[PDB]
Amino acid sequence: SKFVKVYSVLKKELLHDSAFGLTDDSRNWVERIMDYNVPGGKLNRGLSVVDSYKLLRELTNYKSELSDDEIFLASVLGWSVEWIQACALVLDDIMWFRLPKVGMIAINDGLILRNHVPRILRTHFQTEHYYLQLVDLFHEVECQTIAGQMLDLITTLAGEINLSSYSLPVYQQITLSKTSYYSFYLPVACALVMLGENLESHDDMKDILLEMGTYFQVQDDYLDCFGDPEVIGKIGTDIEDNKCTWLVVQALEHCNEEQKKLLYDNYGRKDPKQVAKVKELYKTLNLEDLFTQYENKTCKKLTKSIEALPNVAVQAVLKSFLAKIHKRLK
Amino acid sequence: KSKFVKVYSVLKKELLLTDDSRNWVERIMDYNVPGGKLNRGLSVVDSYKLLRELTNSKYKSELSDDEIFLASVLGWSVEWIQACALVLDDIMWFRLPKVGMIAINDGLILRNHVPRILRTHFQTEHYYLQLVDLFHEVECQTIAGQMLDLITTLAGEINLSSYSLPVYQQITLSKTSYYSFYLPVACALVMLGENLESHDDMKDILLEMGTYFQVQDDYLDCFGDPEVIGKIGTDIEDNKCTWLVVQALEHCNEEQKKLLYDNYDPKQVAKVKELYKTLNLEDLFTQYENKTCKKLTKSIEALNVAVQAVLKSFLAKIHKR
């Protein structure tokens, strides 16, 4: 319910005393990029820092209080997460010779945004013990995000010509490196490092959180096709947009040459009739049930692995995440 | 001369206790980083040598063995950056994302080495944080160039009109110019204990000097003495976004544009290079070269003469090669 006012705070800090942002007209220029890319509603990820910090602190042990400045710093890390998300997504909406110019514009927008996170961390965490551990954490996620984004770029462009480019290892690598790292690992890891701990003793939680991010994106991908548009509020467009959906990949693995030509001849096309031809081929593969298998299997696998963690509070946080994502329609 | 024995010790500290896949990481390291040339590592040391031989605090002498070591450690960090920047240039339709996935993860392994190098060897210095800023800046500019070059090279397979001067200049600037010319000098400067944000004028010079160097490369790869270079120019065959192609596409506004579209086999490649000749291009190079050299010489002399001596040394080692 609390509205995270911190966004305007950080914008005022960066746009004033910092290192750049001198000319009034450059200050306005930077602000337009900032507000177009970062505070785009949703904000489920950055708060998950706060929910994680709140549950970790409520269940640890003595030293036990609650400061407003603590909430402030946790929310600042949450906004750093939203900045990372913004940089990861800069290249997602493409719509030939006009393409390098468009990419150059987008790249340089995201280039501007990547140079804000270090200033935020320095301004607000220079003096803390865990500052370097935080910078390590963000450099890891930053570089993994960048790797996934570069692979996604190769795939989406090579996906325009010949759909056979979409494969399960490529989809899983993009989903893991581009998305899963910043979305699920980084929030909890931020709450952990701010409590003054070392991530090198939580490698088991990382694999769980990373796989849950892949599960969350496979959840997303499935909903973008079979999810009651009246509940979502919008119609699934992934098939029109020629996206690298979990569904398309699993189809191309299990389909045959007659079904492959059906996918080659229809997928990507704007024609609605063809999108339905695709969705019917998805049903014809009985994919829905394969999804139910993947979901049930992943949930049991994660539940088992989670309950085996020592820190019971971490177990509570991951269980909270899993129970909030499970079989969701939103 | 300086036999840089030390890569063994750097690799040994990093490698060394890791399952038995240690060799796999080691093969990526020595396949990608040590190439022998190492012009991106020695220019670091030579630059520190000139910057150090200028600060006349008492009597100019020789750098301590530990000093040479740390300067060489940064130069090799530079070589790591260079290796990561170039991981994707030997790309070779589909099958591109699988190849790219291998390459990106190779560069990811090497990208996770530079922070460990700096921490092990610069944890205690004042300027350590300035190093992390500098390397993240150059790394991110490098990554930006790689993404634009990627989009551009793919859009270069489809329609030759895609290659344009702003895209070429941005690629040259972000992908190459930062680590090649700025980064060495900036490393030597940060070890001298200086704030890079007081040298923005030198940065503009070095970045343009890197773009100037790549236009030079493009020119030699086409109108050279292969006996002096030791290699035949393939850029026109390889369908690269050459300085020549963009300048051609600006001026070829008729049947000459179609002649170039129906090209890119040496039977055709010779028709291209002859069409390049038709546009007095050699003269445009000499004009661009003389103009940029005088402009850069002016901007440099317009600058701490120590910075000027280093930049002038770079330009005099590059000029008209």
Residue numbers in the entry:
A (entry chain A): 6 to 66, 69 to 102, 114 to 348
B (entry chain B): 5 to 20, 27 to 102, 114 to 285, 289 to 327, 329 to 346
From the reporting publication:
The crystal structure of apo EuTPT3 was determined from two crystal forms with space groups P43212 and C2, refined at 3.0 and 3.3 Å resolution, respectively. All dimers observed in the two crystal forms were superimposable with a root-mean-square deviation (RMSD) range of 0.797–0.941 Å over 595–633 aligned Cα atoms. The superimposition parameters suggested that the dimeric architecture of EuTPS3 was highly conserved and unlikely to be caused by crystal packing. In EuTPT3, α6 of one subunit interacted with α5 and α6 of the neighboring subunit to form a four-helix bundle, whereas, in EuFPS1, α4 of one subunit was inserted between α5 and α6 of the neighboring subunit to form a six-helix bundle of α4–α6 at the dimer interface. Thus, EuTPT3 had a larger central tunnel than EuFPS1. Our structural analysis identified a unique, TPT-type dimer conformation, in which the central tunnel connected the active site with the bottom of the molecule. Crystal structure of EuTPT3 showed that the residues Ile164-Ala165 contact with Ile164 and Ile125 of the neighboring subunit in the hydrophobic tunnel, suggesting that smaller side chains such as valine and glycine provide the wider path for the product that may contribute to the activity difference. Furthermore, EuTPT3 conserved a hydrophobic hollow in the bottom region of the dimer interface. These observations suggested that the longer polyisoprene products may pass through the hydrophobic tunnel at the dimer interface.
